[PDB]
Amino acid sequence: KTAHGWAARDASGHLSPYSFSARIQGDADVTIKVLFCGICHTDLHVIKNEWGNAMYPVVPGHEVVGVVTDVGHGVTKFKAGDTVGVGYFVDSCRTCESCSTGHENYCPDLVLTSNGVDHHHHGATTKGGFSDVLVVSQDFVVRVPESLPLDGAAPLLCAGVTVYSPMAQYALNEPGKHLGVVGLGGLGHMAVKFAKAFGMTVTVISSSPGKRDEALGRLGADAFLVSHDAAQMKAAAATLDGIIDTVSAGHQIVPLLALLKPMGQMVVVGAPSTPLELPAYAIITGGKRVAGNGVGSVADCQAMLDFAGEHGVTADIEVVQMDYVNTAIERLEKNDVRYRFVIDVAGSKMEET
Amino acid sequence: KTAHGWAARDASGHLSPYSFSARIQGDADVTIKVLFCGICHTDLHVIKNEWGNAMYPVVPGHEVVGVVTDVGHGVTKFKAGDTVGVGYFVDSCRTCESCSTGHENYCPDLVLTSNGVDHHHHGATTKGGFSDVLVVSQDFVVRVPESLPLDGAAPLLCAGVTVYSPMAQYALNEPGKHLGVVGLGGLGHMAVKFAKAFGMTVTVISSSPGKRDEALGRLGADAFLVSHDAAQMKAAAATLDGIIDTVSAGHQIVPLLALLKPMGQMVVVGAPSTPLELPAYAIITGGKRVAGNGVGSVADCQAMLDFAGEHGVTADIEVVQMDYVNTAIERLEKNDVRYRFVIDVAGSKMEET
Ligand SMILES: NC(=O)c1ccc[n+]([C@@H]2O[C@H](COP(=O)([O-])OP(=O)(O)OC[C@H]3O[C@@H](n4cnc5c(N)ncnc54)[C@H](OP(=O)(O)O)[C@@H]3O)[C@@H](O)[C@H]2O)c1
Ligand SMILES: [Zn+2]
Ligand SMILES: [Zn+2]
Ligand SMILES: [Zn+2]
Ligand SMILES: [Zn+2]
């Protein structure tokens, strides 16, 4: 009934061992030994309270690959030994229009995996995958295809589904279509990977000239634009069918909309604290479209994993021990990872002795 | 892995939560969820460093009852779900004369359950039953009969085997035999219970007249003798087939030997710091015998449990939570318990949250 993770106690975001009372496995619950957990920039936003919604102490982590060690009496979707994943949320109300039409990810009572409010269990705060053992409803766990490496698959549970889902939603998943990806980070590099697997033409828009070689080589993007180079950006005006914006800091979207063809679709998935400034003319003139996307439904996540397993899509990762997590967080803040940190949780000393 | 117990850090003996590295279940090892652990004066002597051999931090506990939760691939003597006990020691060299003949309790390289030196694992210190999970060689685990309460059985693993083994060895084990028990603490009350289960007539011998009602009421002894009453002692001269001497305070042995019939047997299980004064004539004249013993072999312990299960022999206990342990120890220093504390380990919060 005691679980063990690493938590932040205040806005410094400094992580250190934390023991806490864990939820007991109920009839519909699955017990998961955490093997790997990706570090998402959302975890950094939360532990530093950049959105103002941190409930300290915070146990981060919501890109989880693990193995089932026990299931409740009512569980039928999983059994001990199954390789499974947990993403950004672990529960929902189950009844509202969103929950009833397969869009539980937009439920107003969503229970986040990390720093969420467990409405079905006395409103306790949820502790994420920076911990040894999770207890999750069978209806919010996904199966990891055996063809995927467990560490390279972990960032798919948030980074991957968040970019995969809008590509399917907005028909930005067909050969010949031209997609822009803004911010070649965790989400961004997954967008490039999935877009190229769909056969799309991909332009990367980046503030980091040093990412050019890997973007055009390893990742296979077709073009690379430096966003603070007015000449490069102007040359690409009105060339894109769609653009996925993953930028985590405040930024201007007018130059990004300028890259879209008339009627083109911008998908915002980055979540900076500073509001985006949208002049009306920048969407009126060419009938352009802006949409937000939040991860995917559980079924969306499973479909993304099935696709990744069939096409060999995995994140480019740097695997680290938990004792390195504060250095990893600092490097993520400094934009110094290619392109996702993954914590080897099961191989780390989680408790201090 | 990491295990969780309560440990002393210095000679104050004050116990508080303590996490430590646990050794891995090997091929011949058994994993035991600790349910109950008795407390006895040996634990107090260790944690207060009164023998100068405390290796801090010290996790006490050597009267352990638990349930098997996992076994190594080569284990044949136990399976998950078995109710088991662990006594004073958990390993031995296995090769010496004592070990090879089933008397490993006399191994010079004995591995104690608490504050022992695990010679087979880099001499690491052993942590006792004041903890949540133990890993022990299958050859040093005993089976607790289901006919016994798990908490009342725990002190049998120390005091019970200490008094049972000599009763069986020296034929002080049949109706019509008259047994004296010197002292009325943990060991004394155990000796009376086993003696009664054998059908013997039991005389409690004490230097404190105040223990009379205790001996004749609660415990149901047949007679009570004040060791200072010269006339009453003289009237009982040469009436006892055996005596179990449990007293740890300095005391004269000659008056107790006088109670023995010729060829009678005295068994010393308490250890006074002052040597016993034994005039040769006191044993020569009537061919009397004096022997000592502590806890027995694994086989001794199992034979004691089998007998106890067949006759309903259980210790008189007071069950306490771990967070009360320091108060229990203070009370035990004054012998303010009837007659043994047992910690409800599985029912206690062992970690800090
Ligand atoms: N919508 C959802 O459901 C969802 C899911 C997951 C994450 N997110 C959010 O998406 C964002 C990205 O997450 P992530 O894990 O991918 O983060 P990340 O790895 O840090 O990548 C973000 C990227 O944004 C770009 N960037 C950063 N600072 C910038 C600046 N000052 N100006 C311009 N560009 C900048 C960088 O790319 P370049 O170096 O190429 O410029 C950087 O690599 C975060 O806000 C996070 O909370 C949202
Ligand atoms: Zn995320
Ligand atoms: Zn809902
Ligand atoms: Zn003992
Ligand atoms: Zn030996």
Side-chain angles (χ1 to χ4, degrees):
Chain A
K1 198 174 214 308
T2 301
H4 316 95
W6 282 42
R9 270 69 165 190
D10 59 56
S12 73
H14 178 77
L15 301 170
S16 62
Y18 178 60
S19 294
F20 53 95
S21 182
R23 183 165 79 79
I24 59 172
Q25 176 188 267
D27 291 324
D29 292 318
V30 177
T31 300
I32 302 168
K33 174 182 183 181
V34 177
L35 300 173
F36 295 102
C37 192
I39 305 182
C40 177
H41 201 125
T42 289
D43 296 307
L44 171 55
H45 290 310
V46 172
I47 62 179
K48 298 214 179 186
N49 208 17
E50 296 173 10
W51 297 330
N53 62 6
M55 295 178 292
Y56 292 112
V58 175
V59 175
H62 59 268
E63 292 184 336
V64 181
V65 172
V67 55
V68 179
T69 61
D70 197 18
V71 302
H73 289 337
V75 174
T76 63
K77 301 181 171 181
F78 302 97
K79 62 187 183 302
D82 286 347
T83 303
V84 298
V86 179
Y88 183 60
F89 56 91
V90 289
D91 210 351
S92 69
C93 67
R94 314 305 302 275
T95 305
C96 66
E97 187 171 7
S98 298
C99 283
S100 295
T101 64
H103 298 283
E104 61 271 11
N105 53 316
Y106 297 136
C107 170
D109 293 317
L110 193 68
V111 180
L112 305 186
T113 302
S114 167
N115 196 51
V117 179
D118 197 347
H119 301 295
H120 293 152
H121 300 103
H122 308 116
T125 62
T126 58
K127 287 74 176 178
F130 287 22
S131 64
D132 53 6
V133 178
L134 300 175
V135 178
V136 181
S137 159
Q138 66 170 335
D139 297 329
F140 294 77
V141 180
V142 295
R143 317 169 215 95
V144 182
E146 58 181 356
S147 73
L148 294 175
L150 303 194
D151 53 352
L156 302 180
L157 276 293
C158 185
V161 65
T162 298
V163 298
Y164 182 88
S165 300
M167 287 185 214
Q169 177 68 35
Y170 297 105
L172 296 168
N173 62 342
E174 302 175 4
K177 287 196 174 180
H178 202 161
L179 182 74
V181 178
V182 194
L184 191 65
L187 273 63
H189 94 293
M190 290 314 310
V192 178
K193 283 171 172 288
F194 279 115
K196 295 307 302 176
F198 285 122
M200 308 180 76
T201 303
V202 178
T203 298
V204 171
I205 300 94
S206 172
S207 68
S208 297
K211 291 181 180 176
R212 175 178 262 104
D213 288 340
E214 283 197 12
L216 297 173
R218 185 190 193 181
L219 290 169
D222 299 85
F224 185 91
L225 302 180
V226 175
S227 56
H228 59 245
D229 187 334
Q232 297 180 35
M233 296 286 288
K234 182 171 179 294
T239 58
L240 306 179
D241 302 295
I243 184 159
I244 301 177
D245 180 354
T246 81
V247 176
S248 51
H251 63 286
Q252 291 295 305
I253 57 169
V254 169
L256 304 179
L257 292 169
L259 300 176
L260 287 175
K261 301 194 286 204
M263 302 172 291
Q265 176 72 241
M266 162 170 291
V267 183
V268 177
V269 295
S273 53
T274 294
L276 308 172
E277 296 194 61
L278 177 52
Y281 79 82
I283 51 170
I284 287 177
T285 293
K288 291 170 188 179
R289 302 161 189 166
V290 180
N293 176 79
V295 293
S297 66
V298 177
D300 289 337
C301 191
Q302 189 65 74
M304 176 279 303
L305 285 170
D306 296 343
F307 179 99
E310 295 179 359
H311 293 72
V313 180
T314 59
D316 300 338
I317 64 172
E318 183 172 340
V319 180
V320 299
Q321 301 267 288
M322 186 62 76
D323 58 23
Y324 187 81
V325 70
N326 287 311
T327 304
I329 290 291
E330 188 64 37
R331 285 178 53 198
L332 180 58
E333 181 168 280
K334 287 171 180 174
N335 197 359
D336 179 40
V337 66
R338 303 288 188 103
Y339 293 85
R340 249 286 192 278
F341 286 113
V342 177
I343 303 174
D344 182 2
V345 179
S348 293
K349 185 170 150 51
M350 291 302 305
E351 300 165 75
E352 46 185 354
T353 60
Chain B
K1 298 189 181 185
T2 301
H4 315 98
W6 279 47
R9 267 74 171 185
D10 54 55
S12 78
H14 186 76
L15 303 181
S16 63
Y18 175 65
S19 302
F20 52 94
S21 176
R23 74 181 191 82
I24 189 72
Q25 174 182 272
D27 189 78
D29 291 324
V30 174
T31 301
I32 300 166
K33 179 192 196 305
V34 178
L35 300 172
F36 298 97
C37 190
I39 316 176
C40 90
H41 279 93
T42 295
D43 297 303
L44 276 47
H45 290 328
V46 175
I47 61 178
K48 288 186 182 299
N49 197 35
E50 291 169 348
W51 297 330
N53 63 345
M55 299 175 287
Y56 295 106
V58 176
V59 174
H62 62 273
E63 304 176 11
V64 188
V65 172
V67 58
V68 180
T69 61
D70 193 12
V71 300
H73 174 73
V75 172
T76 61
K77 298 177 180 180
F78 300 96
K79 61 183 177 180
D82 284 353
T83 51
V84 297
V86 178
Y88 188 59
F89 54 91
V90 289
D91 211 348
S92 69
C93 84
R94 315 304 305 274
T95 61
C96 70
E97 178 182 1
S98 297
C99 284
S100 60
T101 62
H103 297 282
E104 66 283 339
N105 47 315
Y106 300 131
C107 179
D109 300 319
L110 191 69
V111 181
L112 301 190
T113 300
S114 169
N115 197 60
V117 184
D118 195 350
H119 309 294
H120 284 177
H121 301 94
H122 302 291
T125 64
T126 56
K127 287 74 178 177
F130 287 27
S131 66
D132 53 4
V133 175
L134 299 179
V135 176
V136 183
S137 164
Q138 68 173 334
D139 297 326
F140 293 81
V141 179
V142 294
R143 186 66 151 274
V144 177
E146 298 171 356
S147 64
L148 296 174
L150 303 194
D151 50 358
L156 301 182
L157 299 165
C158 175
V161 68
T162 296
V163 300
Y164 173 85
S165 298
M167 293 187 197
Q169 173 68 39
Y170 303 118
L172 301 167
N173 66 346
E174 56 181 52
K177 301 245 171 167
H178 301 246
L179 187 79
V181 175
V182 194
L184 210 64
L187 281 168
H189 101 284
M190 281 278 87
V192 175
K193 284 171 164 281
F194 278 100
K196 289 165 67 66
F198 279 118
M200 292 191 285
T201 304
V202 183
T203 299
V204 173
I205 303 151
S206 178
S207 58
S208 302
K211 294 192 174 75
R212 181 174 196 273
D213 301 333
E214 195 173 339
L216 300 179
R218 177 193 256 271
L219 293 168
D222 300 282
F224 179 80
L225 284 176
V226 177
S227 53
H228 311 304
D229 283 343
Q232 273 69 19
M233 292 288 278
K234 180 173 184 296
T239 61
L240 303 183
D241 299 281
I243 293 172
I244 309 300
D245 185 345
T246 75
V247 174
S248 294
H251 63 286
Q252 303 186 334
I253 207 78
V254 167
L256 306 171
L257 293 172
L259 301 176
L260 291 173
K261 304 177 170 188
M263 304 175 296
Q265 178 77 55
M266 164 168 292
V267 182
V268 176
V269 295
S273 64
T274 57
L276 306 175
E277 292 296 326
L278 179 61
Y281 78 83
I283 49 171
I284 286 172
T285 295
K288 296 176 184 176
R289 302 161 191 168
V290 180
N293 67 274
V295 304
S297 65
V298 177
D300 294 335
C301 190
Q302 188 68 72
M304 175 280 302
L305 287 172
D306 293 346
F307 179 88
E310 295 157 354
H311 296 89
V313 181
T314 67
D316 295 336
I317 62 174
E318 184 182 331
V319 184
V320 301
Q321 303 292 110
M322 186 63 86
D323 62 25
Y324 184 84
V325 68
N326 289 309
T327 305
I329 288 171
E330 298 162 20
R331 290 176 53 190
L332 176 54
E333 295 173 25
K334 298 167 174 175
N335 293 289
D336 177 35
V337 64
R338 299 291 181 267
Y339 288 85
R340 284 303 180 89
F341 289 111
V342 174
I343 302 169
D344 177 9
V345 176
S348 291
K349 251 53 176 159
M350 296 291 291
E351 301 169 60
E352 287 180 18
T353 61

